[PDB]
Amino acid sequence: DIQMTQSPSSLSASVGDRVTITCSASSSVTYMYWYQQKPGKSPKPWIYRTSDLASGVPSRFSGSGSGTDFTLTISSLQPEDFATYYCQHYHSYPLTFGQGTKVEIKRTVAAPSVFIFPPSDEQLKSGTASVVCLLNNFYPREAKVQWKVDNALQSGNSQESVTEQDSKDSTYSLSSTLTLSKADYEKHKVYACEVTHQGLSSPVTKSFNRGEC
Amino acid sequence: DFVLDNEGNPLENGGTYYILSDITAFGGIRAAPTGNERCPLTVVQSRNELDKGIGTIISSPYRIRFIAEGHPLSLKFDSFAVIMLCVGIPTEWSVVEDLPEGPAVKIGENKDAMDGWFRLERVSDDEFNNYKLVFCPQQAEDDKCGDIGISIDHDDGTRRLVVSKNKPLVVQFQKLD
Amino acid sequence: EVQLVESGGGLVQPGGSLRLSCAASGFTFSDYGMVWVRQAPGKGLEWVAFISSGSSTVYYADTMKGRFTISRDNSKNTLYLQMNSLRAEDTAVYYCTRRNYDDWYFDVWGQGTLVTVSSASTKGPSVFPLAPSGGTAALGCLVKDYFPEPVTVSWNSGALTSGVHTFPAVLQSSGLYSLSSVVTVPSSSLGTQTYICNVNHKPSNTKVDKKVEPKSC
Amino acid sequence: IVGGQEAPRSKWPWQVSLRVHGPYWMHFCGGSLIHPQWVLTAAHCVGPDVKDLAALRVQLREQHLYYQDQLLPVSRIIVHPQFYTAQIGADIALLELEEPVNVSSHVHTVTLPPASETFPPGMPCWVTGWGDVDNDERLPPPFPLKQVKVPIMENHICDAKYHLGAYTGDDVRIVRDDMLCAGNTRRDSCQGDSGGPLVCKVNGTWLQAGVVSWGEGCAQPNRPGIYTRVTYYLDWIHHYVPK
User: Would you identify the family this protein belongs to, as annotated (chain B)?
Assistant: First the structure.
């Protein structure tokens, strides 16, 4: 019945920037509702009846529109505005939400601090080896991690995990896990993690020599 | 929704309003003699920016207090000064077809008037209440209605209200005192 | 305090049934319209259902109508969601939310309850240390091979929170989850200061406390 | 309501007021309670551009409009599918309440007529509402609910009267089969009464004959009030409203 199309799906903006999120209803509606949801948290009412702010919502937020076109505006983006925003109609049943707009905050470039971790003796017993490379507190998100085992480039045996922008300083941390069989791990000596990032004048390599150094 | 005046208030069914332009360049709606007319029978848009025109009584046969978008309407000028022999002319707006300018908005006795209704439709701009007028023949689907636009007279420059397939006339309403 | 507390989520096989409940407190429950909203992992909010104050009016999203039933018990201040013929696509956190009386926005939401629709077996994780090595040192815990989500990690029973990063889990080829939790500490603290990661996996009632320390080399 | 009087508190327990959200919960139309969970009104009241369910409320019978409001939520709005701009007609709509009303002697439903009831002239009929007391004359504060007995005028006689002093040809119908005529130059419904009930007492029971719909002005010569004929729409009403 009423379908919501929200745009953009994600944006990155600087502190003090004017930010505009839009919502299009498939057919004309009287009001628009907006919610803010932070990662791992439950949503909060943000704007209702198109332009009324929920309790505690700061006045840098505003809502506008009519008919099929509505917007949520942040007049001066703040670090605490880091969240996903959703539009919702209350025209008729069925109710629908827009797909959401993820808002990220820009900050100065920060190079990652890189750490390499060999598989533990406890895990080696089990017949599997996990080699972990950590990229700590960097900005922007873009980072290239390449594994080298005796200088041979590894492909398809690693997985990456990235945290959400840190609430203290807007940085990310990233893990790259290299998974090998105990037999394949014991067949090689040098385990290297090669990291490329905007904050690094040159790619950084973190290494160790198998088992007991 | 209810059609709103330039103070943000819903238009009253049977209320009197100046029909002004969305643009500062043109005035309000009024009546003027055109061609061989002996009385001001042509509905025009004034070229004098300061002229608010003639107060227009906007109504719907529906027994609702306010003018809504999509409701059938009738429009008529309120009393205005005319020459002695034109006193008493009907002020109801009619659309008469088979005219060089196309179907034209006229007042006065029009036995040949097309059977139908006017309707008002909001023309999106956000914080401004702008509308277009549309004429609908009896039992017509929306696709069969005609937007009211302006046909500038080839000789005079007079801005005549006509059913037009080109840019519609965009207006706002100002309530009379 | 106005509150909504969801319960009853968990792992269910495809084709299975589950009843969710939401306990309301701090308001006169029988005066309010109540709704269910779900959110698949990493996806957006999806409206599920609505129920009027007196239960006479119920509405559902197209993809859940028939299979899901919303009800309430005003004498128990409880909202329910009966979910039948469950599918993999129903996997989500289910939120209970109250419709604002005057203005109809969803003003109170519970913390949500995770429902995982899968034929895969519950498995507790294996915890391995990420041993460190002046300045700053990094150490951690590798939380390997568990199912389903979630896993919780704390350091020194909550007394160490500064510099902690717990990674979102990644789903491996084996269909099991794995994550790491890391912490940066001063290099001078190693050897003197004890670092223990407290891994908690409620889905399997597994609790592991692992001391992280430098080895012989 | 033109002519007539303030209604005693005990009369017209089915009268409702439809409210729209704004600077205040403004009355835009009347309605009638036809089932503990359903309100009958005019399509023009809620269409062709239907407002969100959040923007509307139902107010059951009150002696003074805006004094002691108790607003009720709506779960559904149904405009007759044949209602459209360029034709006066199919002017009927339904609002489903979220909860059935707990009926009392002071607040209860009106009986819908059987299909055979034509409501001929002579019949005792009354129209109620909080509308204008004359052309361009508001009902003044404290906005008491008013009532007026109106005479029924046969459809063909009424259609001929609407052709008097008009450009419209005798060839085309103005007053149709789905319409009913009532009122005169002293007694009529007016702006603000739209959507409200026209009721007639038949064999001891009050039946809703019509819904206030349209007219040319109020209480004007050769222009009686036009109502949607309820009998014509019974099959449509019964596709939603339990019998």
Answer: Belongs to the protease inhibitor I3 (leguminous Kunitz-type inhibitor) family.
Residues D137 and D170 occupy one common structural domain: yes
Pairing of strands C113-117, C11-12: parallel
Helix ranges (DSSP H) in chain D: 43-46, 155-163, 234-237
For residues A1 and A85, state if they share a domain. Answer: yes
User: Is-contact C130 C184, C-beta < 8 A?
Assistant: no
In CATH, what number is assigned to the domain containing residue D43?
A: 2.40.10.10
Residues in chain D with CB shorter than 8 Å from the CB of B145 are: 85-86
Which residue, B60, B90, B88, B81, is CA-closest to B72? B60
Residue D160 and residue D72 share a domain = no
φ/ψ of A142, rounded to 5, equals -60, 120
Domain that holds residue D166: 1-12+110-231
Cβ separation C103–D54 shorter than 8 A: yes
d(CA D241, CA D234): 10
Q: D102 and D67, same structural domain?
A: yes
Angstrom distance (rounded) from CA B88 to CA D216:
20
Q: Which of C10, C2, C92, C76 is nearest to C43 (CA)?
A: C92
| Number of structural domains chain D divides into | 2
CATH number for the domain spanning A143: value is 2.60.40.10
**Cβ atoms A5, A28 nearer than 8 A:** no
On whether any CB of chain C is under 8 Å from the CB of D114, the answer is: no
User: In sequence order, what are the residues at sequence separation of 6 or more whose Cβ sits closer than 8 angstroms to the Cβ of residue C165?
Assistant: A136, A163, A166, A173, C181, C182, C183
Question: A151 and A73 in one domain?
Answer: no
- Contact flag A64-B126 (C-beta cutoff 8 Å): yes
Q: At A29, give phi and psi (nearest 5°).
A: -140, 155
Residues A65 and A91 in one domain: yes
Among C5, D118, C184, residue whose Cα is nearest residue A171: C184
The CA distance from C43 to B148, in Å, is: 48
Q: How many CA atoms, within 13 angstroms, populate the side-chain half-sphere of residue B113?
A: 24
How far apart, in whole angstroms, are the C-alpha atoms of residue C36 and residue C19? 13
DSSP string, A66-92: EEEEEEEEESS--GGG-EEEEEE--SS
**CB contact set of D22 (below 8 Å; sequence gap of 6+):** none
Report how many domains make up chain B: 1
Chains in touch with A (3+ beta-carbon pairs under 8 Å) read: B, C, D
Query: Which residues in A have their CB inside 8 Å of a CB on D?
Result: 28-31, 49, 89-93
- Just list the catalytic residues of D: 44, 91, 194
Residues in D closer than 8 angstroms to A29, CB to CB, are 52
Domain total of chain A: 2
Topology (CATH level 3) of domain C120-217: Immunoglobulin-like (2.60.40)
Q: How many Å apart are CA D194 and CA D184, to the nearest integer? A: 17
User: How many CB pairs lie under 8 A apart between chains B and D?
Assistant: 80
Tokens of D53: 């369910």
Name every residue whose Cβ is closer than 8 Å to that of residue C65 and which is 6 or more positions away in sequence.
Answer: none
Residue D98: its chain C contacts at CB < 8 A?
33, 52-54, 56-57
Give how far B154 is from chain D: nearest CA, Å: 32
Last residue of a domain, one of A84, A107, A130: A107
Whether B84 contacts B19, CB under 8 Å: no
Query: What's at A149, amino acid-wise?
Result: V
Q: How far is CA B99 from CA B103, B148, B149, in A?
A: 6, 15, 15
| Separation between Cα atoms, residue B42 and residue B99, nearest integer Å | 12
Nearest CA distance, C73 vs chain A (angstrom): 23
**Domain finish residue from A72, A107, A142:** A107
Range of the domain at A118: 108-210
The range of the structural domain enclosing residue B138 comes to 1-177
